[PDB]
């Protein structure tokens, strides 16, 4: 048995040495000459005075106008962000929701939480009402994050140290991803949806191939639970957000962190991470009731979206990059522009 | 406005549904059930009548409880305990069927959690009779070597009560210890009395008068 422990140590050290060789520079150096982004003094353009309880997730439709919001009130509400009109209010089978996803087509919504199942809702059933198209039971723990690849395929991350790919049409676990040693609290699929990364409370984020199931890369920058994860819009980098008060910009091809974001005035943990469409801004959310717009290249806090009265649970830039919406335990969704 | 004028009416209508639903849901006295494995959580849930969480809704003396049992979560509590803020009280089973230190660790974590500094821990010392039986042959010192006293039911039960009370490091909050033999129907009445006292206290907090 002990031979495998030696092999693990030596292989991890091989990865570490290979990255030490690949560490010829750092983004903080090469980007020095690039201009500051200035004072990004965004304003709250709308406040979605809907939910009556903690908002735990919100997600953007590909049309960049409809955002779905999920709350402990047991409701998934569809928001017309340009008008703050509610278009669907879906009473869940379980009040204990902790994630929410909008299918890219706009056809389905996914939901889940402590019920340990992911609920797939059909927004455009011919009967008109939003009926549950399928319930994806099979996790042995709370479903922590959900993300559609399309109307049928959906990936999930759950408290029981695993991520799983399903057929929302039939309900099977088409493929299941294992290798976390802790709760997989976060999930983000690449912009082309060919692979995804998930951040787990084992203080690491892991890269999964949806077709092969292989865990071909692993990232280990943090020393805390990685509450949030998000691909850089080019799909070759992703931001990891942790309770350790540091967002960290990893690179797929570099195989470890390019730059680590931190400032010591902040001690709260990160609850969300969200790039702006250019990849130049990182609107990370904090438990301190404020989201801080980091200059993603020069690693400088360049503005703050202060205004929530309680921790921000989620943040998301519109797929077109027009706006960034953040949701908070204050029960309000704010649209920032 | 041409027909978004009607989408506006839809939005207002389902906002009204949200309002009514929120009012209806606020009335329910949320209660979180905690305690070590097999420590009798299921037994009280059963006596009070009516996979990752099993809400046991039941109504007593005009007051609707929602007793949430979370025992199915073999996962880190800190990642979802914050969902259970504003549970009007924690209902805490202790199994004196045997020994328990795990139960003290669980209680200490729960009552000192930053999320529950305002949340009272109702604390049912259940299976009292079996405790009395084992005391007659197996002393309480097998659980607490520091226990310096006469090994008897009347003393050991109060010692256990005092131990659990002592984990409340914030004087802001109450602990309501009540013994139970797991064979009585007064249990729900006990929960009701503790919950009404907690409701009084938590209303007075909001009024700023307390």
């Amino acid at each position, epitope marked *: 048995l002990d031979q495998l422990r030696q092999e693990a140590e030596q292989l991890k050290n091989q990865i570490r040495d290979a990255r030490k060789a690949c560490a010829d520079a750092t983004l903080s150096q090469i980007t020095n000459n690039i201009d500051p982004v200035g004072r990004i003094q965004m304003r709250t353009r709308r406040t979605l005075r809907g939910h009556l309880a903690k908002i735990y997730a919100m997600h953007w439709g590909t049309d960049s106008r409809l955002l779905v919001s999920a709350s402990q009130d047991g409701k998934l509400i569809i928001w017309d962000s340009y008008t703050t009109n509610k278009v669907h209010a879906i009473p869940l089978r379980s009040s204990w929701v902790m994630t929410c996803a909008y299918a890219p087509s706009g056809n389905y919504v996914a939901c889940g939480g402590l019920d340990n199942i992911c609920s797939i809702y059909n927004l455009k059933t011919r*009967e*008109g009402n939003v009926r549950v198209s399928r319930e994806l039971a099979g996790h042995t723990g709370y479903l922590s994050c959900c993300r559609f690849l399309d109307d049928n395929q959906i990936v999930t991350s759950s408290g029981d140290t695993t991520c799983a790919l399903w057929d929302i049409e039939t309900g099977q676990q088409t493929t299941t991803f294992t290798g976390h040693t802790g709760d997989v609290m976060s999930l983000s699929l690449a912009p082309d949806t060919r692979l995804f990364v998930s951040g787990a409370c084992d203080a690491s984020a892991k890269l999964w191939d949806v077709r092969e199931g292989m865990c071909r890369q692993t990232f280990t920058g943090h020393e805390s639970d990685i509450n949030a994860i998000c691909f850089f819009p080019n799909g070759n980098a992703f931001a990891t957000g942790s309770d350790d008060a540091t967002c960290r910009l990893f690179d797929l091809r570099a195989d470890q962190e390019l730059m680590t974001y931190s400032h010591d005035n902040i001690i709260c943990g990160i609850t969300s991470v969200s790039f702006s469409k250019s990849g130049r801004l990182l609107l990370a959310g904090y438990d301190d009731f404020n989201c801080n717009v980091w200059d993603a290249l020069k690693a400088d806090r360049a503005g703050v979206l202060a205004g929530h009265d309680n921790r921000v649970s989620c943040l998301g830039v519109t797929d077109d990059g027009m706006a960034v919406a953040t949701g908070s335990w204050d029960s309000f969704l704010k649209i920032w522009n | 406005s*041409a*027909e*978004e004028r*009607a989408a506006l009416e839809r939005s207002k*209508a389902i906002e009204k549904n949200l309002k009514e639903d929120g009012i209806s849901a606020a009335k329910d006295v949320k209660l979180l059930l905690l305690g070590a494995d097999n420590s009798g959580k299921s037994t009280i849930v059963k006596q009070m009548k009516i996979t990752g969480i099993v809400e046991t809704h039941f109504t007593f003396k005009n007051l609707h409880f929602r007793l949430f049992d979370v025992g199915g979560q073999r996962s880190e509590r800190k990642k979802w305990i914050h969902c259970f803020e504003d549970v009007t009280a924690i209902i805490f089973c202790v199994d004196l069927s045997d020994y328990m230190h795990e139960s003290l660790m669980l209680f200490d974590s729960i009552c000192n959690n930053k999320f529950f500094i305002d949340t009272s821990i109702i604390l049912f010392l259940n299976k009292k009779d079996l405790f009395g039986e084992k005391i007659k042959k197996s002393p309480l010192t097998i659980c607490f070597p520091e226990y310096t006293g006469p090994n008897t039911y009347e003393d050991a039960a109060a010692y256990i009560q005092a131990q659990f009370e002592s984990k409340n490091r914030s004087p802001n909050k109450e602990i309501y210890c009540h013994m139970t033999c797991a064979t009585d129907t007064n249990n729900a009445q006990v929960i009701f009395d503790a919950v009404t006292d907690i409701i009084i206290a938590n209303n007075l907090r909001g009024c700023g008068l307390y």
Partner: single-chain antibody
Amino acid sequence: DVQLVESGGGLVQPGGSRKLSCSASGFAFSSFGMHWVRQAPEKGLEWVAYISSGSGTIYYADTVKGRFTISRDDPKNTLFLQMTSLRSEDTAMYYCVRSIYYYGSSPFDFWGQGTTLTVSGSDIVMTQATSSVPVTPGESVSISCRSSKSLLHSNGNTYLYWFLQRPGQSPQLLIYRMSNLASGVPDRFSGSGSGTAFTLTISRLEAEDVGVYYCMQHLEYPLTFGAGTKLEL
């Protein structure tokens, strides 16, 4: 199985009164808005009344209002249209049509079978020059539709709707908001045009597409219908 069944229409005397009804099933009637669409025996459609979901807002045309009243019996899923003082112009058939409004919705998406009946000016108006059109299988045809005021609203929507009343059948929604294919419509339909002039193309026509096409504005009530296109094989 979405279902919507009108009833209550029949022969009645000049100056008489009647009550029509439409019984829904298979869909959440409570959440949909309901429409009634008149059709004289040898003429195009006319919008009669609209009953909103929750019955808060109710609309009527000038030729109907002051003599008609409507209501929804929500728990039985049956909408009621009450009509009084019927004149010969009321000899029409009356269709029952559901709608619901939200970003991306498709109003008028389902039509009833139509209840027949017999009796023994500043608003938007629309026209179609293609009153008749000889067409053939495999050909392609373009119904032409215009308006007196632009249907393109400031919010970027253009509220033009295209319906097909196949011979004997009920009107089927083909294109809503002048570009969008309603559910179940084949890929071969398309909507086009902007402002006050509109056109819908039928690519690779088939005998199953024969019938009379209607063009309706939704910009503001009353929803005036076009005279329609008698596409005949």
